[PDB]
């Protein structure tokens, strides 16, 4: 199959990448980063995320694989087992599995769109952060506090977890909204609890006074001036992993957080 | 269609019941409380819970309709809209349920329970200490007051009070939540609520004391010689008769934010 | 000084007690378990708690000391292997008294009053309670229960409920919620509440008057309760301390390492 | 007595100011900005915080009182309609001075800061990692969004939003909360808010980045090449002119639970 490899940039990753390419050359396997069928990410969850954002238009289409070295949540392979992976990919014993993604829409006074693998957060630019939270066109709460976080199911182990969020198995078709430091008084009454929305539900953040926000999708923070609305829904797009065995998710959670 | 109506027992619930029943006299709908097609519950979520459990062998046969003499989370009908409900008496919409299996160390067979809201586990007196096993792999040793496994529709009740996420009831899941964990040198728990898909099994295994207070919805039984309590999303679902799309998040707002 | 020793009853603690009693025979110190000036607890916080509850009518006149084998925890500053230093130091009188606040609970129906070293809890067994602060309605709580903690008790059950850990010198009590429903009909504050001396917190049933009330230790089923009242006790517990008590390092050693 | 008046700067508050200054002319009451003995704030806890900070070099000689021109918050015990009644009582001097504890922050690169509400530490943009040292002994290694040290009167503010306990402002203490700590068997923290007495010092020591966004109440400055941030209860207090018992828990009820008459 057509394949390509990204590496973190350090010595180890770059060497692994050249060795794996050399090993694929022995097989009916062509390198191609324009239209790849498999993407292999070497380094860690940062280089994986970068690869995901490199190929947002071809997600349909691509099966991702991660290598690195505490595996975390976007890898099931270590450098000392890469040769075994070349062979198994080789021909061809997997195993496609898909995780839900998150779509963010920002409207002004031209609409901008973003796909997240982990989460999207909103904060104030200037002073107070105050926002009306509208669910399916119906007002839910007037939030005042630090910010809000909408997470994918795979994203729930990251920022979402710090904020009091539920940890969700990544197969579940949903997105999850957590508060950052809500005032929660009688003027700005909020739910407190993390909220989990199914497919087709849209959450809308509507400014009450100040219309400037810091929005950050996965890695990247952007300042948005004169925002009329921010919209959240489960994306139509999914991310696909090439799986060679059942991904032991709850075991990873144990190994990461428990220990 | 065959039908029956349950009531809270108070003045208003019994009156509205006799009213609807007289309202079903004009049409080809016979009263039957042995094998009915529609169960109508009047009096709120406690009442609705009792009707669900009254007919849990015939869940594949029944559509439930809740009337709250008010609304809650299992009723979309007020006791003045009743007249327009009788006339209409639909799409059958399904909520996911929770299977609880209690396995014993003595010559007694496993007991299975279905929950619409939650199943909880606490000790019978002394400290509560249990090993949590997910898909046959030790996940944590929990010490604390107890544990709570919620259905998606149960997330608005006890689960919410414990720090759980609220989930739209259409989502195929169960959510595990902690009651007053201990975290110290010895005990380390995850802390966070955990949301499992269908086909996953969370197993509770005793460490020192085999006696547990296990609650299923309203009902809490003292269980002895317990060797394992097992949780999973049930293959069975409850069916609601929906005459309009249920505004779930609006109902969360009204109960909690208004 | 008149003094007495309690051990938990296992051999190791029983025989440290006997050998401390003999070591004290060499000085001007008299074994007296009716009116002691020094209570020594050997074996753990369970034993120290029982000692505190045995001598609560003379908290005025007693200084406490705890000895313990493992991680010393919050009510001991001595391990067995140091017992001979303590005997000498105590006997030469080389210590400073240090005090912790306590919690008074009053249960009305007739009237019952209780002192706590750690905490006092209220659970039902449909627990709806009106929470009244300094005679003013504060909230109507519905949930599993409520917990009022002393400063020293903040590392126990209070901690599991989301409460602040407080240094045991601060004159206060701390109220925490267990599983408040916190809706439209039963709005609660959520946060733990820290009260100074002379403030009074009153729990008043709205429907069912039966409650499981706990005071440290002892859970009592109180029948037909009209009111449970909390306030910082006028009484304090006194420790004989031979150096600065390293409270925050004990928090670390219990919870972090 | 010598007095001055700060307003939020909306017409409502600016006019109340001029009405009161005129009212005080019926008495022996001297308007003075440099050396006031009574600072009156008009327009909310934010306006009160600014006034405090204007006169933090002379806290022992000033008694503060607040009028809140919307509702009232936690620092204003007076409504705009009670202004004239307040003009009289102040002119008599029928008030007890009640003091609240303050928080001192020291930053070493030494700059020191007083807070009436809190002081927070966040990172520039990178991960926030700091060693937390209590009374010269390492307590935990914190990684997360930030840390917040509150005064007792500041517990009703940001501290509360972070899961902090609400404390009566008479209590001589400071309270430390976590902002979105990471707990993953590498960065284990206590989780619980911590309440320190007087004379205890909490020390934040950088690990692998020495640049921090430090906040003190309203004010937020980027400190570079920081070696240490130290917190402790200040020896300085703020004094309020009290004409009647401040009903703190009722104000907590009104703000956070409900207010069925207003």
């Amino acid at each position: 199959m057509k394949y390509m490899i990204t590496s973190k940039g350090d010595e180890k990753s770059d060497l692994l990448r050249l060795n794996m390419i050399a090993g694929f050359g022995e097989y009916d396997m062509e390198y191609d980063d324009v239209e790849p069928e498999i993407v292999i990410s070497i380094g860690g969850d940062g280089t994986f995320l970068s690869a995901f954002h490199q190929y947002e238009e071809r997600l349909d289409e691509i099966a991702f694989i991660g290598i690195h070295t505490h595996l975390g949540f976007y890898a099931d392979w270590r450098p000392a087992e890469a040769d075994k992976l070349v062979k198994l990919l080789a021909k061809g014993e997997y195993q496609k599995v898909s995780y839900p993604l998150l779509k963010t829409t920002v409207k002004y006074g031209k609409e901008a769109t973003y796909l997240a693998l982990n989460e999207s957060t909103v904060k104030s630019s200037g002073g107070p952060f105050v926002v009306d939270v509208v669910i399916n066109d119906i007002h839910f709460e007037r939030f005042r506090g630090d910010g809000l976080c909408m997470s994918t199911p795979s994203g729930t182990t990251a920022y979402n977890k710090s904020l009091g969020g539920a940890l969700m198995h990544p197969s579940i078709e949903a997105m999850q909204l957590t508060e950052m430091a809500s005032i929660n008084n009688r003027v700005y009454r909020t739910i407190g609890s993390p909220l989990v929305f199914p497919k087709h539900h849209v959450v809308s953040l509507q400014p009450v006074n100040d219309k400037d926000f810091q929005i950050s999708v996965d890695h990247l923070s952007i300042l948005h001036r004169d925002v009329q609305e921010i919209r959240y829904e489960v994306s139509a797009k999914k991310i696909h992993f090439a799986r060679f065995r059942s991904f032991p998710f709850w075991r990873r959670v144990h190994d990461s957080f428990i220990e």
Side-chain angles (χ1 to χ4, degrees), chain A residues 1-11 13-25 27 29 31-67 69 71-80 82 84-86 88-90 92 94 96-109 111-227 229-259:
Chain A
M1 324 186 88
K2 296 294 190 202
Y3 78 96
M4 76 82 59
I5 314 187
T6 20
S7 35
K8 184 179 163 72
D10 61 4
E11 186 173 23
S13 316
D14 284 14
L15 198 56
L16 252 201
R17 182 172 88 101
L18 292 191
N19 297 330
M20 285 191 84
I21 284 161
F24 284 122
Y27 299 96
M29 208 96 168
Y31 197 101
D32 182 354
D33 60 16
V34 168
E35 287 180 6
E37 224 155 353
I38 285 141
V39 173
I40 293 159
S41 159
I42 304 182
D45 282 15
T47 133
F48 192 95
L49 187 64
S50 187
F52 161 83
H53 285 287
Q54 182 177 341
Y55 289 109
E56 288 168 49
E57 296 310 333
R58 223 195 162 277
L59 286 168
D60 347 309
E61 213 100 81
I62 288 168
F64 291 86
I65 311 177
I67 297 162
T69 210
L71 282 171
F73 296 95
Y74 301 117
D76 208 38
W77 292 100
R78 287 162 201 272
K84 179 154 167 276
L85 175 63
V86 172
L88 281 172
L89 260 175
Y94 76 72
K96 263 187 154 209
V97 150
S98 66
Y99 290 4
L101 271 3
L102 174 68
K103 177 185 149 89
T104 303
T105 300
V106 193
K107 314 222 278 168
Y108 308 98
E111 158 190 304
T113 306
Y114 311 92
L115 251 194
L117 180 52
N118 286 333
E119 78 281 299
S120 177
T121 57
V122 278
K123 262 165 276 320
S124 207
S125 190
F129 171 82
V130 191
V131 130
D132 276 317
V133 184
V134 174
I135 299 172
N136 297 323
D137 304 317
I138 299 146
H139 178 266
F140 185 71
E141 71 197 359
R142 189 166 288 189
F143 184 96
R144 182 167 178 162
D146 281 2
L148 289 153
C149 181
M150 188 66 89
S151 180
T152 61
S154 48
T156 52
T157 48
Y159 201 25
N160 175 83
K161 181 179 185 303
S162 302
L163 299 177
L167 302 198
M168 302 182 63
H169 189 276
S171 70
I172 294 176
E173 278 160 41
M175 57 178 192
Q176 176 183 190
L177 181 72
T178 54
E179 302 175 351
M180 308 187 206
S182 190
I183 312 290
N184 195 199
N185 58 22
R186 65 174 188 79
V187 175
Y188 302 105
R189 262 291 147 59
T190 65
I191 191 69
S193 309
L195 309 181
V196 180
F197 306 90
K199 225 167 72 92
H200 311 299
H201 284 212
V202 11
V203 172
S204 197
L205 312 178
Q206 285 169 203
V208 335
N209 273 316
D210 177 29
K211 273 152 184 50
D212 297 355
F213 305 95
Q214 295 286 340
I215 291 86
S216 46
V217 187
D218 297 328
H219 19 42
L220 37 85
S221 258
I222 291 164
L223 178 58
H224 293 267
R225 283 184 171 85
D226 204 40
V227 172
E229 201 205 326
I230 304 146
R231 199 167 269 242
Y232 289 121
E233 58 198 279
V234 170
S235 181
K237 293 164 159 281
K238 301 209 83 194
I239 177 178
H240 299 257
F241 289 86
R243 301 306 215 203
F244 294 90
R245 86 288 268 168
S246 287
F247 190 73
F249 178 72
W250 298 115
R251 182 54 155 156
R252 280 298 211 283
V253 169
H254 172 86
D255 285 359
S256 296
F257 301 108
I258 297 267
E259 164 229 310

PDB file of all heavy atoms in Angstrom, chain A residues 84-99, unseen atoms left out:
ATOM      1  N   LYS A  84       8.736  -5.932  13.323  1.00  0.00           N
ATOM      2  CA  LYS A  84       7.502  -6.725  13.391  1.00  0.00           C
ATOM      3  C   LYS A  84       6.300  -5.997  12.753  1.00  0.00           C
ATOM      4  O   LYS A  84       5.421  -6.630  12.173  1.00  0.00           O
ATOM      5  CB  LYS A  84       7.200  -7.076  14.861  1.00  0.00           C
ATOM      6  CG  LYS A  84       5.930  -7.893  15.102  1.00  0.00           C
ATOM      7  CD  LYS A  84       6.039  -8.706  16.383  1.00  0.00           C
ATOM      8  CE  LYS A  84       4.697  -9.273  16.823  1.00  0.00           C
ATOM      9  NZ  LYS A  84       3.901  -8.288  17.607  1.00  0.00           N
ATOM     10  N   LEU A  85       6.277  -4.671  12.863  1.00  0.00           N
ATOM     11  CA  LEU A  85       5.182  -3.854  12.322  1.00  0.00           C
ATOM     12  C   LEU A  85       5.281  -3.730  10.797  1.00  0.00           C
ATOM     13  O   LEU A  85       4.270  -3.786  10.097  1.00  0.00           O
ATOM     14  CB  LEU A  85       5.170  -2.471  12.990  1.00  0.00           C
ATOM     15  CG  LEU A  85       4.195  -1.398  12.503  1.00  0.00           C
ATOM     16  CD1 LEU A  85       2.756  -1.808  12.701  1.00  0.00           C
ATOM     17  CD2 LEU A  85       4.475  -0.107  13.237  1.00  0.00           C
ATOM     18  N   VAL A  86       6.496  -3.556  10.292  1.00  0.00           N
ATOM     19  CA  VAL A  86       6.740  -3.562   8.845  1.00  0.00           C
ATOM     20  C   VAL A  86       6.165  -4.839   8.215  1.00  0.00           C
ATOM     21  O   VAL A  86       5.431  -4.769   7.235  1.00  0.00           O
ATOM     22  CB  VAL A  86       8.256  -3.465   8.515  1.00  0.00           C
ATOM     23  CG1 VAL A  86       8.515  -3.667   7.019  1.00  0.00           C
ATOM     24  CG2 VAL A  86       8.823  -2.123   8.960  1.00  0.00           C
ATOM     25  N   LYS A  87       6.504  -5.990   8.794  1.00  0.00           N
ATOM     26  CA  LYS A  87       6.022  -7.288   8.318  1.00  0.00           C
ATOM     27  C   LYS A  87       4.500  -7.434   8.393  1.00  0.00           C
ATOM     28  O   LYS A  87       3.872  -7.901   7.446  1.00  0.00           O
ATOM     29  CB  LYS A  87       6.687  -8.423   9.104  1.00  0.00           C
ATOM     30  N   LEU A  88       3.907  -7.030   9.512  1.00  0.00           N
ATOM     31  CA  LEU A  88       2.456  -7.169   9.711  1.00  0.00           C
ATOM     32  C   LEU A  88       1.659  -6.248   8.795  1.00  0.00           C
ATOM     33  O   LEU A  88       0.653  -6.655   8.226  1.00  0.00           O
ATOM     34  CB  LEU A  88       2.084  -6.904  11.165  1.00  0.00           C
ATOM     35  CG  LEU A  88       2.330  -8.031  12.170  1.00  0.00           C
ATOM     36  CD1 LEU A  88       2.080  -7.511  13.583  1.00  0.00           C
ATOM     37  CD2 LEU A  88       1.440  -9.228  11.884  1.00  0.00           C
ATOM     38  N   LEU A  89       2.112  -5.003   8.688  1.00  0.00           N
ATOM     39  CA  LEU A  89       1.613  -4.062   7.683  1.00  0.00           C
ATOM     40  C   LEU A  89       1.866  -4.667   6.316  1.00  0.00           C
ATOM     41  O   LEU A  89       0.929  -4.993   5.578  1.00  0.00           O
ATOM     42  CB  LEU A  89       2.355  -2.727   7.770  1.00  0.00           C
ATOM     43  CG  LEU A  89       1.688  -1.578   8.490  1.00  0.00           C
ATOM     44  CD1 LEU A  89       2.670  -0.413   8.561  1.00  0.00           C
ATOM     45  CD2 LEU A  89       0.433  -1.197   7.727  1.00  0.00           C
ATOM     46  N   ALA A  90       3.157  -4.755   5.988  1.00  0.00           N
ATOM     47  CA  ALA A  90       3.688  -5.688   4.987  1.00  0.00           C
ATOM     48  C   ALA A  90       2.617  -6.417   4.213  1.00  0.00           C
ATOM     49  O   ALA A  90       2.350  -6.088   3.055  1.00  0.00           O
ATOM     50  N   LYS A  91       2.016  -7.424   4.851  1.00  0.00           N
ATOM     51  CA  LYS A  91       0.826  -8.040   4.299  1.00  0.00           C
ATOM     52  C   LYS A  91       0.013  -8.914   5.302  1.00  0.00           C
ATOM     53  O   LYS A  91       0.566  -9.846   5.901  1.00  0.00           O
ATOM     54  N   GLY A  92      -1.263  -8.566   5.571  1.00  0.00           N
ATOM     55  CA  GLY A  92      -1.568  -7.186   5.959  1.00  0.00           C
ATOM     56  C   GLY A  92      -2.599  -7.020   7.156  1.00  0.00           C
ATOM     57  O   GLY A  92      -3.749  -6.684   6.890  1.00  0.00           O
ATOM     58  N   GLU A  93      -2.240  -7.402   8.398  1.00  0.00           N
ATOM     59  CA  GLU A  93      -3.236  -8.352   9.136  1.00  0.00           C
ATOM     60  C   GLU A  93      -3.802  -7.283  10.154  1.00  0.00           C
ATOM     61  O   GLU A  93      -3.259  -7.102  11.254  1.00  0.00           O
ATOM     62  N   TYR A  94      -4.847  -6.557   9.740  1.00  0.00           N
ATOM     63  CA  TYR A  94      -5.432  -5.439  10.523  1.00  0.00           C
ATOM     64  C   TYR A  94      -6.720  -5.020   9.758  1.00  0.00           C
ATOM     65  O   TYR A  94      -6.673  -4.840   8.515  1.00  0.00           O
ATOM     66  CB  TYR A  94      -4.413  -4.279  10.670  1.00  0.00           C
ATOM     67  CG  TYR A  94      -4.240  -3.453   9.422  1.00  0.00           C
ATOM     68  CD1 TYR A  94      -5.250  -2.597   9.005  1.00  0.00           C
ATOM     69  CD2 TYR A  94      -3.081  -3.527   8.653  1.00  0.00           C
ATOM     70  CE1 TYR A  94      -5.130  -1.848   7.864  1.00  0.00           C
ATOM     71  CE2 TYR A  94      -2.943  -2.774   7.503  1.00  0.00           C
ATOM     72  CZ  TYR A  94      -3.976  -1.934   7.110  1.00  0.00           C
ATOM     73  OH  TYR A  94      -3.863  -1.178   5.964  1.00  0.00           O
ATOM     74  N   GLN A  95      -7.870  -4.847  10.447  1.00  0.00           N
ATOM     75  CA  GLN A  95      -7.934  -4.203  11.765  1.00  0.00           C
ATOM     76  C   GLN A  95      -8.027  -2.675  11.586  1.00  0.00           C
ATOM     77  O   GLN A  95      -7.111  -1.964  11.984  1.00  0.00           O
ATOM     78  N   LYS A  96      -9.110  -2.165  10.994  1.00  0.00           N
ATOM     79  CA  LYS A  96      -9.367  -0.710  11.005  1.00  0.00           C
ATOM     80  C   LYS A  96     -10.437  -0.359  12.031  1.00  0.00           C
ATOM     81  O   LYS A  96     -11.480  -1.014  12.114  1.00  0.00           O
ATOM     82  CB  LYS A  96      -9.787  -0.181   9.640  1.00  0.00           C
ATOM     83  CG  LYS A  96      -8.669   0.421   8.812  1.00  0.00           C
ATOM     84  CD  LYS A  96      -9.225   1.065   7.532  1.00  0.00           C
ATOM     85  CE  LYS A  96      -8.315   2.178   7.012  1.00  0.00           C
ATOM     86  NZ  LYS A  96      -9.061   3.263   6.241  1.00  0.00           N
ATOM     87  N   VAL A  97     -10.175   0.698  12.787  1.00  0.00           N
ATOM     88  CA  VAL A  97     -11.027   1.118  13.892  1.00  0.00           C
ATOM     89  C   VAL A  97     -11.075   2.628  13.863  1.00  0.00           C
ATOM     90  O   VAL A  97     -10.055   3.266  13.585  1.00  0.00           O
ATOM     91  CB  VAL A  97     -10.457   0.574  15.234  1.00  0.00           C
ATOM     92  CG1 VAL A  97     -10.771   1.461  16.410  1.00  0.00           C
ATOM     93  CG2 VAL A  97     -10.978  -0.836  15.486  1.00  0.00           C
ATOM     94  N   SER A  98     -12.244   3.202  14.156  1.00  0.00           N
ATOM     95  CA  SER A  98     -12.423   4.650  14.069  1.00  0.00           C
ATOM     96  C   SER A  98     -12.875   5.352  15.363  1.00  0.00           C
ATOM     97  O   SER A  98     -13.742   4.858  16.085  1.00  0.00           O
ATOM     98  CB  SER A  98     -13.389   4.987  12.937  1.00  0.00           C
ATOM     99  OG  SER A  98     -14.677   4.502  13.228  1.00  0.00           O
ATOM    100  N   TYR A  99     -12.260   6.513  15.624  1.00  0.00           N
ATOM    101  CA  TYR A  99     -12.616   7.425  16.731  1.00  0.00           C
ATOM    102  C   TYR A  99     -13.377   8.658  16.204  1.00  0.00           C
ATOM    103  O   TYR A  99     -13.076   9.155  15.111  1.00  0.00           O
ATOM    104  CB  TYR A  99     -11.360   7.946  17.431  1.00  0.00           C
ATOM    105  CG  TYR A  99     -10.565   6.959  18.256  1.00  0.00           C
ATOM    106  CD1 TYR A  99     -10.895   5.599  18.323  1.00  0.00           C
ATOM    107  CD2 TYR A  99      -9.443   7.401  18.964  1.00  0.00           C
ATOM    108  CE1 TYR A  99     -10.121   4.719  19.085  1.00  0.00           C
ATOM    109  CE2 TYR A  99      -8.689   6.550  19.711  1.00  0.00           C
ATOM    110  CZ  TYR A  99      -9.021   5.211  19.773  1.00  0.00           C
ATOM    111  OH  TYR A  99      -8.240   4.393  20.549  1.00  0.00           O
TER     112      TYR A  99
END
